[PDB]
Amino acid sequence: LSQDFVEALKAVVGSPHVSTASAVREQHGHDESMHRCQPPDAVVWPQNVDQVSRVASLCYNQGVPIIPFGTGTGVEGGVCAVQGGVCINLTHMDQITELNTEDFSVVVEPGVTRKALNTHLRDSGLWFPVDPGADASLCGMAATGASGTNAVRYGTMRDNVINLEVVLPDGRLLHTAGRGRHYRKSAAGYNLTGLFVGSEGTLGIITSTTLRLHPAPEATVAATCAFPSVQAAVDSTVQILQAAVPVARIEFLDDVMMDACNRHSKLNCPVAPTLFLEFHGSQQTLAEQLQRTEAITQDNGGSHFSWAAEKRNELWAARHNAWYAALALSPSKAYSTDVCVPISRLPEILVETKEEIKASKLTGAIVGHVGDGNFACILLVDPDDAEEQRRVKAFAENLGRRALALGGTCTGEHGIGLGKRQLLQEEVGPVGVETMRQLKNTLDPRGLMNPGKVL
Ligand SMILES: Cc1cc2nc3c(=O)[nH]c(=O)nc-3n(C[C@H](O)[C@H](O)[C@H](O)COP(=O)(O)OP(=O)(O)OC[C@H]3O[C@@H](n4cnc5c(N)ncnc54)[C@H](O)[C@@H]3O)c2cc1C
Ligand SMILES: CC(C)[C@@H](O)C(=O)O
């Protein structure tokens, strides 16, 4: 990467905000996944949207790849600079603007995390529900199409993103639903917002997100329920959803995951396949949701609810850190699967996955947003064991195809990145692939917008 080009970058954002140092680049060449670190040629921190546009234009017209970088908590190698180029760390734009409490909406820049937004919303009676376990950039969550434990009731990022400000690859500024606009529904033209949610930085750079806010629940109750088998826990989940109990959270941990979270946190739950549950409503509706949910779990051998305030906070902090609890079993890197299937097929595939984990030499922990028909298998890797690494690939790839055989999807929330590109081709077929690629080509003709990812 030439000296003239570095100086041009410095002319846009300022000398302290451009780095070609090896250590700085290596810190931006990987996320939380096992994908090998591939350092960008430079890291740049733009200070405002005009600078983002000018950096993109400079890179695009010089043939230099662009890698958007949020908080680096992705798990599919999205930020890995597989073709080098300029990593654009967006987190110095960290302002919350256009807070509209009366319309339930807010605008956030990429440096704002969910924790920052909800802390600033304290005493407002509103909150933002989509809750990945990591302290992630909200614009990064828009880019990956993230969900979370609350999504079963309050929706995913796709459900809660109202508008996006996007710097297109050549530097043009797009407001996907129109500058400053926010509303509950629209039929005006083609919905551009949904195209950029889940685009993983391959269609442009999200520089602000307009988010739907939600009213805080009147009352909240959380509990855990232990089961004799995976089958019993997942049958309960499916029957709770089919009875239309509006649970706020319903999370599955197998016995391995439960034990790992016990060891990594303040919990001392029975080591067994377990559901973490949370209910929102008034006192009347809570008692009614509880009684219907306990009846279903009892029918499948579930324990009486272990109730949980500080202890719901420790409960959900343990769940949110399950990824790190799993890593701490083999102090190793990990790969995560992320399939999502029609809910009636969830018992088949979860039980089958548990049986396959045991039948193989591999270690795995299972945790899942099962209210969405979604779960993750966390598979540890010795970073220096090449034989283990292909067995992990082979396992994750066979699980993905089993989900596809059931009518599901290879990723419910994490995205495709580097790891699921072949599975995506099988999921949507040749006309789906060509259509997606035609969309990529019109927004990024030169193929410089995070190349090598998704497609
Ligand atoms: C402990 C843990 C728990 C997690 N739990 C969940 C969970 O429950 N649900 C879930 O969905 N994910 C979860 N994740 C994954 C991850 O946190 C999410 O995918 C999150 O949305 C990534 O955001 P980020 O800014 O950290 O992404 P990064 O890793 O910085 O980037 C991810 C991808 O998005 C692109 N990108 C980032 N920011 C932008 C932007 N502003 N504009 C355009 N493209 C951009 C990058 O180029 C890359 O391709 C978890 C991760 C960890 C470590
Ligand atoms: C599996 C990890 C990465 C996240 O998706 C979670 O559900 O906690």
* Full DSSP string of 362-408: ---EEEE-GGGTB-EEEEEE-TT-HHHHHHHHHHHHHHHHHHHHTT-
Up-side HSE of residue 364: CA atoms within 13 Å toward CB? 28
Q: Look up residue 302 and give its DSSP letter.
A: P
Ligand found nearest the CA of 365: 2
- Which SS3 state, helix, strand or coil, does residue 115 take? helix
Cα-flanking dihedrals φ and ψ of residue 336, to 5°? -115, 130
Ligand 1 contact via 147 beta carbon (within 6 Å)? yes
Q: Are residues 73 and 118 in the same domain?
A: no
Q: Is 429 domain-assigned? A: no
Q: Are residues 250 and 312 in the same domain?
A: yes
Count other Cβ atoms within 10 Å, centred on residue 135: 12
- The count of structural domains within the chain is 3
Widest CA span of the chain, in angstroms?
Answer: 70
Beta-sheet strand order (sheet of 333-336)? 306-307, 219-226, 274-281, 249-253, 365-368, 376-381, 333-336
User: From the DSSP assignment, how many helices (H) and strands (E) are in the chain?
Assistant: 16, 18
Q: From CA 63, how far away is CA 29, in angstroms rounded?
A: 19
Q: From CA 20, how far away is CA 404, in angstroms rounded?
A: 42
Q: Is 50 domain-assigned? A: yes
For residue 207, what is the enclosing H or E element?
strand 205-212
Ligand 2 contact via 322 beta carbon (within 6 Å)? yes
Q: From CA 258, how far away is CA 172, in angstroms rounded?
A: 48
Q: Is 292 domain-assigned? A: yes
Structure tokens at 292: 């219907």
Which ligand 2 atom is at minimum distance from the Cα of 148? 7
Report whether 96 contacts 112 (CB < 8 A).
yes
Closest to 204 in 3D by CA, of 139, 281, 301: 139
Q: From CA 178, how far away is CA 192, in angstroms rounded?
A: 10
Q: Are residues 274 and 310 in the same domain?
A: yes
Q: From CA 232, how far away is CA 390, in angstroms rounded?
A: 32
R_g of the chain computed on alpha carbons: 22
Residue with tokens 């009684």: 291
Q: Are residues 106 and 210 in the same domain?
A: yes
Residues 6+ apart with CB under 8 A from 358: none
Q: Is 354 domain-assigned? A: no
Q: Are residues 139 and 195 in the same domain?
A: yes
Which ligand 1 atom is at minimum distance from the Cα of 322? 1
Strand 105-108 with 126-127, pairing: unpaired
Report whether 87 contacts 37 (CB < 8 A).
no
Q: Are residues 168 and 154 in the same domain?
A: yes
Report whether 64 contacts 448 (CB < 8 A).
yes
CATH number at residue 126: 3.30.465.10
Q: Are residues 205 and 262 in the same domain?
A: no
Q: Are residues 110 and 176 in the same domain?
A: yes
* C-alpha 416 chain-centroid distance: 11
Q: How far is CA 400 from CA 7, 198, 395, 405, in A?
A: 45, 19, 9, 9
Ligand 1 contact via 338 beta carbon (within 6 Å)? no
Q: From CA 400, how far away is CA 406, in angstroms rounded?
A: 10
Beta bridge pairs of residue 106: 211
Please report, as a single letter, which amino acid is at residue 46.
P
Ligand 2 contact via 276 beta carbon (within 6 Å)? no
Domain limits for position 254: 219-324
Which ligand 1 atom is at minimum distance from the Cα of 149? 8
Q: What is the dihedral of CA 141, 147, 148, 151, to 10 degrees?
A: 130
Q: Are residues 80 and 120 in the same domain?
A: no
Q: Are residues 70 and 165 in the same domain?
A: no
Residue with tokens 């008692």: 287
Strand 365-368 with 376-381, pairing: antiparallel
Beta bridge pairs of residue 398: none
Q: Are residues 70 and 163 in the same domain?
A: no
Report whether 312 contacts 272 (CB < 8 A).
no
